[PDB]
Write a protein that binds this ligand. Structure first.
Ligand code: OLA
Length: 269
């Protein structure tokens, strides 16, 4: 059980996350209303939400997504798309642990995720900060599904501490770094990380702990099945680094479970 507030936020950013896959939301002109095709993001279409910056095939690893201005909810949202292109997958396979001592001492991160964020950080950082400067009363949130949630996590770790808080909402994200990085993400201030998983979705179980990867705490585990509407009673908060009460269980994993976080995700064309 989580509160309705958290449930509402989780649902909303799940939808900004889903909206990132829509091709049209990756090269839209600035100032256009953000919409999606289907039933991907009805709460987003509420606004009142417009593109600050759309992007596709940026840097290394085909970085894709958008930066949005949400005037109703008063948000500046950086939404990274998860895996779709061959280039993304090649990057997902760059799974060696590289030092990111520049972010936190003794930390290591997925070579591809970090290289990807690294290749677009200077540009994305300026755009977010330009937005903060124009809308000081807006809240900055980074979000994404899977690979997109990995990116948002690394981006949040890198960009906090610059005068504005950054909350990160990740949906079915893989592990991103070693134990030191898991610890750091657990205690880092200047924003909160909401790492959300769903049933036996295989992605948050990768890469393995036996490759040296670790998950930060806490975890919000959705227990309702695939294609099943989520209620706030279906989300359980699980604590402890690499905790096993949620998605990290020694049972058979599932792929369809990866595509259902509140609603369909990773399916918008
Ligand atoms: C269907 C079985 C898939 C098994 C994948 C094993 C991956 C092993 C090591 C790390 C690669 C991580 C890739 C994560 C993919 C998520 C990307 C996404 O869905 O947006």
């Amino acid at each position: 059980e989580v509160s309705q507030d958290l449930f509402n936020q989780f649902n909303l950013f799940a939808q900004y996350s889903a909206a990132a896959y829509c091709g049209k939301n990756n090269d839209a002109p600035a100032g256009t209303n953000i919409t999606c095709t289907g039933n991907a993001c009805p709460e987003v279409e509420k606004a009142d939400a417009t593109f600050l910056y759309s992007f596709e095939d940026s840097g290394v690893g085909d970085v894709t997504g958008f930066l949005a201005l949400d005037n109703t909810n008063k948000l500046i949202v950086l939404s990274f798309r998860g895996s779709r292109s061959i280039e993304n997958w090649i990057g997902n396979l760059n799974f060696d642990l590289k030092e990111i001592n520049d972010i936190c001492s003794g930390c290591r991160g997925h070579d591809g995720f970090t290289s990807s964020w690294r290749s677009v950080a200077d540009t994305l950082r300026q755009k977010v900060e330009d937005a903060v400067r124009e809308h000081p009363d807006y809240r900055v949130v980074f979000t994404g599904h899977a690979l997109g949630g990995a990116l948002a996590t690394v981006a949040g770790a890198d960009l906090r501490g610059n005068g504005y808080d950054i909350d990160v909402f990740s949906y079915g994200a893989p592990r991103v770094g070693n134990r030191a990085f898991a610890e750091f993400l657990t205690v880092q201030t200047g924003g909160t990380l909401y790492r959300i998983t769903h049933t036996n979705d295989i992605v948050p179980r990768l890469p393995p702990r036996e490759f040296g990867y670790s998950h930060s705490s806490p975890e919000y585990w959705i227990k309702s099945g695939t294609l099943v509407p989520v209620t706030r009673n279906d989300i359980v908060k699980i604590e402890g680094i690499d905790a096993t009460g949620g998605n990290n269980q020694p049972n058979i994993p599932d792929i369809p479970a990866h595509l259902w976080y509140f609603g369909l995700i990773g399916t918008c064309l």
